[PDB]
């Protein structure tokens, strides 16, 4: 379960990454 936890947390943080480009996305069209 802990080492579970970091592979999840780690996951949150790449996604978020895609997010940023999600807004900058739109605002091209």
Same mark, same amino acid.
């Given at each position: 379960? +802990?080492?579970?936890?970091?592979? =999840?947390?780690?996951?949150?943080?790449?996604? =978020? #990454? #895609? =997010? =940023?480009?999600?807004?900058? @996305? @739109?605002? +091209? +069209?």
């Amino acid at each position: 379960k +802990k080492k579970l936890g970091f592979f =999840l947390v780690t996951f949150l943080f790449i996604w =978020l #990454m #895609m =997010l =940023l480009h999600f807004t900058i @996305q @739109q605002r +091209k +069209k």
